[PDB]
Amino acid sequence: SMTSHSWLCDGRLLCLHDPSNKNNWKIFRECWKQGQPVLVSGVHKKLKSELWKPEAFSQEFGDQDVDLVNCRNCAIISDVKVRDFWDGFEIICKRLRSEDGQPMVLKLKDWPPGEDFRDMMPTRFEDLMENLPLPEYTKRDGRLNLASRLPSYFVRPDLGPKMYNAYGLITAEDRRVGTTNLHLDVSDAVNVMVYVGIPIGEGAHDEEVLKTIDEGDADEVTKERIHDHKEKPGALWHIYAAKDAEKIRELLRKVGEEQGQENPPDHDPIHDQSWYLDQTLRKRLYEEYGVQGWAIVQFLGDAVFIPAGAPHQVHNLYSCIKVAEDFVSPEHVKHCFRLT
Ligand SMILES: Cn1nc(CO)cc1-c1ccccc1
Ligand SMILES: [Cl-]
Ligand SMILES: [Cl-]
Ligand SMILES: [Cl-]
Ligand SMILES: [Cl-]
Ligand SMILES: [Mn+2]
Protein backbone atom coordinates (compact mmCIF):
# COMPACT_ATOMS: atom_id res chain seq x y z
CA SER A 1 0.00 0.00 0.00
CA MET A 2 1.02 3.72 -0.20
CA THR A 3 2.98 4.78 2.94
CA SER A 4 4.59 8.05 4.11
CA HIS A 5 8.16 6.57 4.55
CA SER A 6 10.40 3.50 5.05
CA TRP A 7 13.99 2.83 6.22
CA LEU A 8 17.24 1.77 4.51
CA CYS A 9 20.76 1.10 6.02
CA ASP A 10 19.20 -1.21 8.69
CA GLY A 11 17.03 1.68 10.12
CA ARG A 12 19.81 4.31 9.93
CA LEU A 13 18.50 6.10 6.70
CA LEU A 14 15.03 7.75 6.41
CA CYS A 15 13.36 7.22 2.94
CA LEU A 16 10.41 9.66 2.33
CA HIS A 17 7.99 8.40 -0.39
CA ASP A 18 5.95 11.53 -1.45
CA PRO A 19 8.20 14.45 -2.50
CA SER A 20 5.32 17.05 -2.16
CA ASN A 21 3.83 15.76 1.21
CA LYS A 22 3.23 19.00 3.29
CA ASN A 23 3.88 16.87 6.48
CA ASN A 24 7.42 15.56 5.48
CA TRP A 25 9.13 18.12 7.83
CA LYS A 26 7.64 16.31 10.93
CA ILE A 27 9.56 13.00 10.04
CA PHE A 28 12.62 14.75 8.45
CA ARG A 29 13.66 17.20 11.18
CA GLU A 30 14.49 14.62 13.93
CA CYS A 31 16.74 12.58 11.58
CA TRP A 32 18.34 15.81 10.19
CA LYS A 33 19.09 17.23 13.70
CA GLN A 34 21.06 13.97 14.46
CA GLY A 35 23.44 14.64 11.50
CA GLN A 36 21.99 11.87 9.23
CA PRO A 37 21.60 12.04 5.44
CA VAL A 38 17.97 11.56 4.14
CA LEU A 39 16.61 10.07 0.86
CA VAL A 40 13.38 11.30 -0.89
CA SER A 41 12.06 9.12 -3.78
CA GLY A 42 9.76 9.98 -6.76
CA VAL A 43 11.03 13.50 -7.77
CA HIS A 44 11.27 12.38 -11.48
CA LYS A 45 7.43 11.96 -11.58
CA LYS A 46 7.09 15.76 -10.70
CA LEU A 47 9.47 17.07 -13.49
CA LYS A 48 9.04 17.79 -17.26
CA SER A 49 10.93 14.66 -18.52
CA GLU A 50 11.64 16.20 -22.01
CA LEU A 51 13.84 18.97 -20.35
CA TRP A 52 16.24 16.40 -18.70
CA LYS A 53 17.34 14.23 -21.70
CA PRO A 54 20.92 14.02 -23.05
CA GLU A 55 19.74 14.57 -26.72
CA ALA A 56 18.09 17.95 -25.71
CA PHE A 57 21.29 19.20 -24.01
CA SER A 58 23.30 18.25 -27.14
CA GLN A 59 20.78 19.88 -29.61
CA GLU A 60 20.47 23.16 -27.55
CA PHE A 61 24.10 23.71 -26.19
CA GLY A 62 26.33 21.34 -28.34
CA ASP A 63 28.50 24.14 -29.89
CA GLN A 64 29.79 25.47 -26.49
CA ASP A 65 33.51 24.97 -25.67
CA VAL A 66 34.22 22.89 -22.50
CA ASP A 67 36.83 20.72 -20.76
CA LEU A 68 36.17 17.04 -19.79
CA VAL A 69 37.86 14.84 -17.17
CA ASN A 70 38.96 11.22 -17.74
CA CYS A 71 37.56 9.45 -14.55
CA ARG A 72 40.18 6.57 -14.81
CA ASN A 73 43.36 8.86 -14.43
CA CYS A 74 41.96 12.42 -13.60
CA ALA A 75 43.57 13.80 -16.87
CA ILE A 76 41.92 16.93 -18.43
CA ILE A 77 40.66 16.80 -22.07
CA SER A 78 40.95 20.54 -22.97
CA ASP A 79 38.88 22.71 -25.37
CA VAL A 80 36.38 20.25 -26.88
CA LYS A 81 32.63 20.74 -27.64
CA VAL A 82 29.66 20.04 -25.30
CA ARG A 83 28.29 17.69 -28.04
CA ASP A 84 31.51 15.45 -27.85
CA PHE A 85 30.30 14.54 -24.27
CA TRP A 86 26.48 14.31 -24.78
CA ASP A 87 26.45 12.27 -28.07
CA GLY A 88 28.44 9.41 -26.33
CA PHE A 89 26.34 9.45 -23.06
CA GLU A 90 24.40 6.21 -23.96
CA ILE A 91 25.75 5.20 -27.41
CA ILE A 92 29.11 3.59 -26.55
CA CYS A 93 30.10 3.54 -30.40
CA LYS A 94 30.15 7.46 -30.26
CA ARG A 95 32.53 7.93 -27.19
CA LEU A 96 36.02 9.52 -27.36
CA ARG A 97 38.52 6.61 -27.26
CA SER A 98 41.81 6.61 -25.27
CA GLU A 99 45.03 5.52 -27.10
CA ASP A 100 44.41 1.84 -26.04
CA GLY A 101 41.28 2.06 -28.33
CA GLN A 102 38.85 1.67 -25.36
CA PRO A 103 35.90 4.07 -24.94
CA MET A 104 36.74 6.57 -22.12
CA VAL A 105 34.68 7.15 -18.95
CA LEU A 106 34.24 10.99 -18.99
CA LYS A 107 32.86 13.76 -16.69
CA LEU A 108 31.68 17.21 -18.05
CA LYS A 109 33.67 19.81 -15.97
CA ASP A 110 32.17 23.13 -14.68
CA TRP A 111 29.04 23.10 -16.98
CA PRO A 112 27.05 25.30 -16.98
CA PRO A 113 30.02 27.43 -15.82
CA GLY A 114 29.94 28.95 -12.26
CA GLU A 115 26.54 30.62 -11.46
CA ASP A 116 25.24 30.72 -15.12
CA PHE A 117 22.66 27.81 -14.79
CA ARG A 118 19.63 30.18 -14.37
CA ASP A 119 20.62 32.53 -17.31
CA MET A 120 21.52 29.64 -19.70
CA MET A 121 18.61 27.31 -18.71
CA PRO A 122 15.64 29.33 -17.28
CA THR A 123 12.88 26.70 -18.01
CA ARG A 124 15.03 23.92 -16.32
CA PHE A 125 15.73 26.27 -13.35
CA GLU A 126 11.95 26.84 -12.73
CA ASP A 127 11.12 23.08 -13.20
CA LEU A 128 13.75 22.03 -10.58
CA MET A 129 13.14 24.78 -7.96
CA GLU A 130 9.30 24.36 -7.93
CA ASN A 131 9.58 20.52 -7.42
CA LEU A 132 12.42 20.28 -4.77
CA PRO A 133 11.34 18.35 -1.64
CA LEU A 134 11.36 20.01 1.87
CA PRO A 135 10.86 23.43 0.22
CA GLU A 136 11.03 25.48 3.53
CA TYR A 137 14.68 24.20 3.74
CA THR A 138 15.66 23.97 0.00
CA LYS A 139 14.07 27.06 -1.82
CA ARG A 140 16.30 30.19 -2.07
CA ASP A 141 13.61 32.09 0.04
CA GLY A 142 12.43 29.15 2.23
CA ARG A 143 11.41 30.02 5.78
CA LEU A 144 14.18 27.60 7.14
CA ASN A 145 17.00 28.46 4.67
CA LEU A 146 19.36 30.97 6.34
CA ALA A 147 21.50 31.42 3.11
CA SER A 148 20.15 34.97 2.41
CA ARG A 149 19.97 35.97 6.14
CA LEU A 150 23.55 35.59 7.52
CA PRO A 151 26.40 38.10 7.90
CA SER A 152 29.97 37.64 6.50
CA TYR A 153 31.01 35.76 9.73
CA PHE A 154 29.37 32.75 7.84
CA VAL A 155 30.51 31.19 4.52
CA ARG A 156 27.49 31.61 2.18
CA PRO A 157 26.79 29.18 -0.72
CA ASP A 158 27.24 30.32 -4.38
CA LEU A 159 23.99 30.73 -6.38
CA GLY A 160 22.98 27.31 -7.78
CA PRO A 161 22.04 24.91 -8.94
CA LYS A 162 25.10 22.83 -10.02
CA MET A 163 25.08 19.83 -12.46
CA TYR A 164 26.99 16.54 -12.06
CA ASN A 165 27.15 14.91 -15.54
CA ALA A 166 29.31 11.77 -16.02
CA TYR A 167 29.44 8.31 -17.72
CA GLY A 168 29.06 5.02 -15.71
CA LEU A 169 32.20 3.11 -14.50
CA ILE A 170 32.31 -0.16 -16.48
CA THR A 171 35.11 -2.70 -15.66
CA ALA A 172 36.26 -4.76 -12.59
CA GLU A 173 39.34 -2.38 -12.42
CA ASP A 174 36.89 0.60 -12.44
CA ARG A 175 35.24 -0.76 -9.16
CA ARG A 176 37.99 1.01 -7.05
CA VAL A 177 37.65 4.38 -8.98
CA GLY A 178 35.52 7.41 -7.94
CA THR A 179 33.30 9.50 -10.21
CA THR A 180 33.72 12.23 -7.52
CA ASN A 181 36.46 11.59 -4.87
CA LEU A 182 35.93 11.99 -1.07
CA HIS A 183 35.30 15.68 -0.06
CA LEU A 184 33.00 17.82 2.14
CA ASP A 185 30.85 20.99 1.57
CA VAL A 186 30.40 23.67 4.48
CA SER A 187 26.73 24.15 3.28
CA ASP A 188 23.87 21.58 3.29
CA ALA A 189 22.75 20.33 -0.21
CA VAL A 190 20.03 18.28 -1.98
CA ASN A 191 21.28 16.23 -5.03
CA VAL A 192 18.49 15.04 -7.45
CA MET A 193 18.95 12.14 -10.00
CA VAL A 194 17.01 13.60 -13.06
CA TYR A 195 18.18 10.97 -15.72
CA VAL A 196 19.89 7.50 -15.85
CA GLY A 197 21.30 6.32 -19.22
CA ILE A 198 21.70 2.53 -19.57
CA PRO A 199 23.98 2.16 -22.64
CA ILE A 200 23.79 0.03 -25.86
CA GLY A 201 26.41 -1.62 -28.17
CA GLU A 202 28.48 -2.69 -25.13
CA GLY A 203 25.04 -3.08 -23.42
CA ALA A 204 24.41 -6.18 -21.22
CA HIS A 205 26.75 -4.78 -18.48
CA ASP A 206 24.22 -5.77 -15.71
CA GLU A 207 26.22 -8.39 -13.63
CA GLU A 208 29.27 -6.20 -12.72
CA VAL A 209 26.68 -3.54 -11.49
CA LEU A 210 25.35 -6.13 -8.86
CA LYS A 211 28.89 -7.12 -7.67
CA THR A 212 29.66 -3.34 -7.30
CA ILE A 213 26.55 -2.79 -5.05
CA ASP A 214 27.33 -6.01 -3.02
CA GLU A 215 31.04 -5.14 -2.39
CA GLY A 216 29.83 -1.51 -1.82
CA ASP A 217 28.19 -2.86 1.41
CA ALA A 218 24.55 -2.01 0.30
CA ASP A 219 21.91 -3.35 2.80
CA GLU A 220 19.51 -6.23 1.88
CA VAL A 221 16.43 -3.93 1.58
CA THR A 222 18.33 -1.67 -0.92
CA LYS A 223 19.06 -4.88 -2.96
CA GLU A 224 15.26 -5.63 -3.10
CA ARG A 225 14.58 -2.25 -5.09
CA ILE A 226 16.68 -3.67 -8.05
CA HIS A 227 15.31 -7.26 -8.12
CA ASP A 228 11.61 -6.46 -7.14
CA HIS A 229 10.25 -3.05 -8.50
CA LYS A 230 12.75 -2.68 -11.46
CA GLU A 231 13.79 0.99 -10.89
CA LYS A 232 17.00 2.28 -12.67
CA PRO A 233 20.02 2.54 -10.24
CA GLY A 234 22.24 5.52 -11.12
CA ALA A 235 25.05 5.87 -8.55
CA LEU A 236 26.63 4.33 -5.38
CA TRP A 237 27.37 6.88 -2.56
CA HIS A 238 29.28 6.59 0.72
CA ILE A 239 28.48 9.35 3.25
CA TYR A 240 30.12 9.78 6.71
CA ALA A 241 28.97 11.86 9.75
CA ALA A 242 30.54 15.36 10.05
CA LYS A 243 31.76 14.28 13.58
CA ASP A 244 33.96 11.47 11.93
CA ALA A 245 35.87 13.80 9.44
CA GLU A 246 39.07 14.03 11.60
CA LYS A 247 39.31 10.19 12.12
CA ILE A 248 39.00 9.82 8.29
CA ARG A 249 41.92 12.38 7.89
CA GLU A 250 44.01 10.27 10.38
CA LEU A 251 43.41 7.05 8.27
CA LEU A 252 44.26 8.83 4.94
CA ARG A 253 47.48 10.43 6.45
CA LYS A 254 48.60 6.90 7.56
CA VAL A 255 47.79 5.35 4.12
CA GLY A 256 49.52 8.30 2.29
CA GLU A 257 52.73 7.58 4.32
CA GLU A 258 52.46 3.77 3.73
CA GLN A 259 52.27 4.45 -0.09
CA GLY A 260 55.37 6.74 0.00
CA GLN A 261 53.55 10.12 -0.27
CA GLU A 262 55.65 12.82 1.53
CA ASN A 263 53.12 15.01 3.41
CA PRO A 264 53.33 17.45 6.38
CA PRO A 265 51.65 15.96 9.53
CA ASP A 266 48.76 18.55 9.28
CA HIS A 267 47.84 18.39 5.51
CA ASP A 268 44.12 17.82 4.72
CA PRO A 269 43.50 14.65 2.57
CA ILE A 270 39.70 15.38 2.49
CA HIS A 271 40.19 18.99 1.16
CA ASP A 272 42.69 17.58 -1.40
CA GLN A 273 39.80 15.54 -3.01
CA SER A 274 42.39 12.94 -4.13
CA TRP A 275 41.05 9.74 -2.35
CA TYR A 276 38.31 7.13 -3.19
CA LEU A 277 37.61 4.74 -0.23
CA ASP A 278 37.44 1.24 -1.88
CA GLN A 279 36.17 -1.92 -0.03
CA THR A 280 39.71 -2.34 1.56
CA LEU A 281 39.89 1.26 2.86
CA ARG A 282 36.22 1.21 4.08
CA LYS A 283 36.89 -2.00 6.11
CA ARG A 284 40.13 -0.45 7.57
CA LEU A 285 38.16 2.71 8.58
CA TYR A 286 35.57 0.56 10.51
CA GLU A 287 38.15 -1.86 12.08
CA GLU A 288 41.09 0.53 12.98
CA TYR A 289 39.13 3.79 13.77
CA GLY A 290 35.58 2.63 14.69
CA VAL A 291 33.89 4.70 11.87
CA GLN A 292 30.71 3.45 10.04
CA GLY A 293 29.17 5.17 7.01
CA TRP A 294 25.97 5.10 4.96
CA ALA A 295 26.14 3.12 1.64
CA ILE A 296 23.34 4.71 -0.52
CA VAL A 297 22.16 3.62 -4.04
CA GLN A 298 20.58 6.69 -5.75
CA PHE A 299 17.92 5.54 -8.30
CA LEU A 300 16.18 7.74 -10.98
CA GLY A 301 14.21 10.48 -9.14
CA ASP A 302 15.95 9.99 -5.73
CA ALA A 303 16.97 13.21 -3.88
CA VAL A 304 19.97 12.72 -1.49
CA PHE A 305 20.15 15.29 1.41
CA ILE A 306 23.87 15.74 2.33
CA PRO A 307 24.53 17.31 5.79
CA ALA A 308 27.00 20.26 6.01
CA GLY A 309 30.49 18.98 6.93
CA ALA A 310 29.70 15.30 6.05
CA PRO A 311 32.48 13.63 3.94
CA HIS A 312 31.01 11.94 0.79
CA GLN A 313 32.13 10.11 -2.42
CA VAL A 314 30.13 9.03 -5.56
CA HIS A 315 30.67 6.07 -8.00
CA ASN A 316 28.36 6.13 -11.09
CA LEU A 317 26.96 2.64 -12.01
CA TYR A 318 25.39 3.96 -15.29
CA SER A 319 25.59 7.37 -17.06
CA CYS A 320 23.94 10.02 -14.82
CA ILE A 321 22.54 13.57 -14.97
CA LYS A 322 22.28 14.98 -11.38
CA VAL A 323 21.31 18.56 -10.28
CA ALA A 324 22.07 19.85 -6.74
CA GLU A 325 21.04 22.98 -4.75
CA ASP A 326 22.93 24.26 -1.65
CA PHE A 327 21.04 25.65 1.43
CA VAL A 328 21.86 26.60 5.09
CA SER A 329 19.58 24.88 7.66
CA PRO A 330 19.52 26.15 11.26
CA GLU A 331 20.40 22.59 12.48
CA HIS A 332 23.88 22.74 10.79
CA VAL A 333 24.81 26.49 10.65
CA LYS A 334 27.86 25.87 13.04
CA HIS A 335 29.67 24.18 10.05
CA CYS A 336 29.97 27.49 8.02
CA PHE A 337 30.95 29.85 10.97
CA ARG A 338 34.42 31.52 10.44
CA LEU A 339 35.40 31.80 14.21
CA THR A 340 36.35 29.37 17.10
C1 LIG B 1 0.41 10.45 -1.58
N1 LIG B 1 1.46 9.44 -1.41
N2 LIG B 1 2.08 8.97 -2.51
C2 LIG B 1 3.02 8.04 -2.07
C3 LIG B 1 3.97 7.38 -3.06
O1 LIG B 1 3.98 6.00 -2.84
C4 LIG B 1 2.94 7.94 -0.63
C5 LIG B 1 1.91 8.85 -0.20
C6 LIG B 1 1.66 9.16 1.17
C7 LIG B 1 1.42 10.38 1.74
C8 LIG B 1 0.89 10.49 3.04
C9 LIG B 1 0.56 9.35 3.76
C10 LIG B 1 0.79 8.11 3.19
C11 LIG B 1 1.33 8.01 1.95
CL1 LIG C 1 26.17 18.68 12.72
CL1 LIG D 1 15.98 25.86 -20.25
CL1 LIG E 1 9.52 21.83 4.34
CL1 LIG F 1 36.77 14.43 -7.89
MN1 LIG G 1 29.76 17.01 -2.82
UniProtKB/Swiss-Prot annotation:
Localization annotation: Nucleus
Domain annotation JmjC: ranges: 121-340
Binding residue positions for Fe cation: 183, 185, 312
Consequence of changing residue 167 to C: In DIJOS; uncertain significance
Tissues where this protein is expressed: Ubiquitous. Highly expressed in placenta, skeletal muscle, kidney, heart and liver.
Known function: Histone demethylase that specifically demethylates 'Lys-9' of histone H3, thereby playing a central role in histone code. Demethylation of Lys residue generates formaldehyde and succinate. May have tumor suppressor activity.
Misc note: Its gene is located in the 5q region of the genome which is deleted in del(5q) interstitial deletion, a frequent deletion found in myeloid leukemias and myelodysplasias, suggesting that it may be a good candidate for the del(5q) tumor suppressor gene.
The record's note on its domains: Leu-Xaa-Xaa-Leu-Leu (LXXLL) motifs are known to mediate the association with nuclear receptors.
Family: Belongs to the JHDM2 histone demethylase family.
Disease field: Diets-Jongmans syndrome: An autosomal dominant disorder characterized by varying degrees of intellectual disability, developmental delay, short stature, and characteristic facial features such as a wide mouth, a pointed chin, long ears and a low columella.
The name this protein goes by in its record: Lysine-specific demethylase 3B
Range of the intact protein held here: 1380 to 1717 of 1761
